[PDB]
């Protein structure tokens, strides 16, 4: 699927907190989540406090992926809205992150490939003596 | 206005719930799969906000629990006054409350 192309949409009504983007946004990547709220309502944002998300499109810039996905799961489970967040490096190159196929990762969409997948039971891994003095570990054959 | 607002016989007095242990919740009112069941039984024993998710039943539980605590404090006071009655030197202390 094509990504959703993060626009300059508005943000929630928040009075400011001490949970924002300190330096991991200035020099490293920071994150941004966008959700379409059917109505204006209050929600507990993951950086501490309580914001009021607006009707229609909302946009909230967060410091790490766990904040974004925690807020997204609370949105999808409590307000039942469809979230999708990105990762914006300090030079640009906004990376589409969460669904990665349009459908949520709990659904087995075709096309996504098997990466990080061993075709063996967990106790058939060789011992560390087999992979000693080799850059590989006991779980990468 | 502030009415009385009570109800009659919400819970049946019986030893049926004395028999089955850990009756007060969903994951403990099945029986011990392990020995963690007993520690989670005693741990969640007075966690009334976990048993029933309404303030009515919670409030009744803590009210009667406060009554049990008051019964215990009165029993402890009875014990102290009684041990001061029959198992004490209170008269000898009154006679000389500096060397007794």
């Amino acid at each position: 699927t094509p990504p959703q192309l993060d626009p300059n949409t508005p943000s929630p009504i928040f009075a400011g907190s001490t949970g924002g983007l300190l330096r991991k946004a200035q020099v490293e990547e920071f994150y941004v989540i966008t959700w379409n709220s059917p109505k204006e309502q209050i929600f507990e944002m993951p950086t501490g406090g309580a914001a009021i998300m607006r009707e229609g499109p909302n946009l909230l810039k967060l410091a790490r992926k766990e904040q974004c996905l925690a807020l997204g799961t609370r949105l999808r489970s409590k307000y039942k809205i469809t979230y999708q967040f990105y990762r914006v490096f300090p030079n640009g190159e906004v990376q589409y992150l969460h669904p990665k196929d349009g459908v949520y990762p709990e659904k087995a969409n075709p096309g996504r490939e098997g990466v990080g997948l061993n075709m063996r039971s967990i106790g058939k891994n060789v011992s560390p003596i087999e992979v000693k003095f080799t850059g590989k570990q006991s779980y990468d054959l | 206005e502030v009415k009385i607002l009570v109800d009659r016989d919400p819970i049946k007095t019986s030893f049926e719930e004395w028999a089955k242990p850990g009756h007060f919740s969903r994951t403990i009112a099945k029986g011990p799969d392990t020995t963690t069941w007993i520690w989670n039984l005693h741990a969640d024993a007075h966690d009334f906000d976990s048993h029933t998710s309404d303030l009515e039943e919670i409030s009744r539980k803590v009210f009667s629990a406060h009554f049990g605590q008051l019964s215990i404090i009165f029993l402890w006071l009875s014990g102290m006054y009684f041990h001061g009655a029959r198992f004490s030197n209170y008269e000898a202390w009154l006679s000389d409350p500096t060397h007794i």
Partner: protein
């Protein structure tokens, strides 16, 4: 009494009854045979 014998069958009630009886037994033995350090009865 039904379901009271099941409660009294429970591990702590049964343990306190057993250990109260047992402790009274040991206590009365130590009253009867105080200060014991040998078994001289053979």
């Amino acid at each position: 009494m039904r379901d009271l014998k099941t409660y009294l069958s429970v591990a702590p009630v049964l343990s306190t009854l057993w250990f109260g009886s047992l402790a009274g037994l040991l206590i009365e033995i130590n009253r009867l045979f105080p200060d014991a350090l040998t078994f001289p009865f053979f």
